[PDB]
Amino acid sequence: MENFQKVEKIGEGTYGVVYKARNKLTGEVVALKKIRVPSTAIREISLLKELNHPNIVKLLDVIHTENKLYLVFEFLHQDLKKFMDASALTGIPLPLIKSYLFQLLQGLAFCHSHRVLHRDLKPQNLLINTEGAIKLADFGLARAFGVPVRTYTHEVVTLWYRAPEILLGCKYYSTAVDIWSLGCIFAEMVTRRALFPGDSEIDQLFRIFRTLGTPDEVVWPGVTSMPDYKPSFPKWARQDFSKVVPPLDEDGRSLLSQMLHYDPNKRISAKAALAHPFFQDVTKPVPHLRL
Numbered sequence: 291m292e293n294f295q296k297v298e299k300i301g302e303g304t305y306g307v308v309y310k311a312r313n314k315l316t317g318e319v320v321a322l323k324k325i326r327v328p329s330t331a332i333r334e335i336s337l338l339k340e341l342n343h344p345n346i347v348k349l350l351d352v353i354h355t356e357n358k359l360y361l362v363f364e365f366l367h368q369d370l371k372k373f374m375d376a377s378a379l380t381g382i383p384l385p386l387i388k389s390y391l392f393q394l395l396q397g398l399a400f401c402h403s404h405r406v407l408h409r410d411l412k413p414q415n416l417l418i419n420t421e422g423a424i425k426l427a428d429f430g431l432a433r434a435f436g437v438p439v440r441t442y443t444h445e446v447v448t449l450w451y452r453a454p455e456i457l458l459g460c461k462y463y464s465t466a467v468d469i470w471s472l473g474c475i476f477a478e479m480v481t482r483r484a485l486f487p488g489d490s491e492i493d494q495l496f497r498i499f500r501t502l503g504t505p506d507e508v509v510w511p512g513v514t515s516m517p518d519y520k521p522s523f524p525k526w527a528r529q530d531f532s533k534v535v536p537p538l539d540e541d542g543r544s545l546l547s548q549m550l551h552y553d554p555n556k557r558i559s560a561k562a563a564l565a566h567p568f569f570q571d572v573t574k575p576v577p578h579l580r581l
């Protein structure tokens with residue numbers, strides 16, 4: 291750590307404090323993430339060093355010193371949560387939403403082709419730059435370190451973007467969980483409000499059910515056999531997506547629906563999503579960022 295000068299605390303991450311820092315020899319500005327160390331975790335993290343893509347925040351190095359672990363990442367100046375709050379009066383323009391979604395799908399397609407999932411996608415870990423790029427931060431860390439109920443500073447880890455199969459107790463969930471999360475994020479960018487802002491696991495589930503309908507064996511074969519499925523769940527009808535994400539045109543609503551399919555095996559893949567007609571006119575606008 292003596293090789294880095296802390297510039298400023300960025301915040302409190304899932305696993306530990308996060309600092310903006312400068313490398314003393316090369317001059318590089320980086321994000322340093324303390325991870326509050328099993329050999330298995332070191333080996334997993336080590337694998338992430340090679341999982342490089344332009345839409346994945348680059349893992350520069352891993353520093354393990356005195357039973358303390360620090361991850362050194364590419365630094366970006368803003369996150370999507372902050373950008374969305376800043377863009378709340380007018381909304382993020384559809385071409386920019388589309389660009390961001392397209393880029394995020396490319397990052398997912400890459401990592402998913404290597405069988406690596408994120409598992410905790412959320413606006414706070416989607417980072418943006420002045421050039422119109424967006425990148426996924428913290429990819430693969432959930433498998434390395436787990437996703438806790440509370441962070442190291444006791445903050446509640448959000449449930450808002452969690453896939454139903456996770457909430458229903460599926461042990462061996464897949465890359466589809468990331469597609470679900472991204473679909474939730476897509477909807478939030480469009481509407482300027484979280485899609486499913488649950489404040490407990492059951493509230494999360496029931497919010498999903500109230501919008502998408504309570505899942506059953508017709509739409510999700512096997513669902514009634516999942517560990518946390520209860521036959522006593524209320525039965526709500528599915529809403530039309532025209533009511534759920536209004537501004538959004540039929541191509542976007544079609545794609546969102548496929549990203550929000552209940553059955554993970556039927557949920558669209560990132561690679562198939564990239565081919566969807568919604569991206570026919572995709573472009574790369576530059577965001578208004580005041581840093």
Ligand SMILES: CC(C)C(=O)COc1nc(N)nc2nc[nH]c12
Binds near residue numbers: 300303368
């Ligand atoms: C929620 C907050 C505490 C956090 O995890 C901040 O994370 C990060 N912030 C910046 N600017 N660049 C990064 N590169 C990788 N992760 C990054």
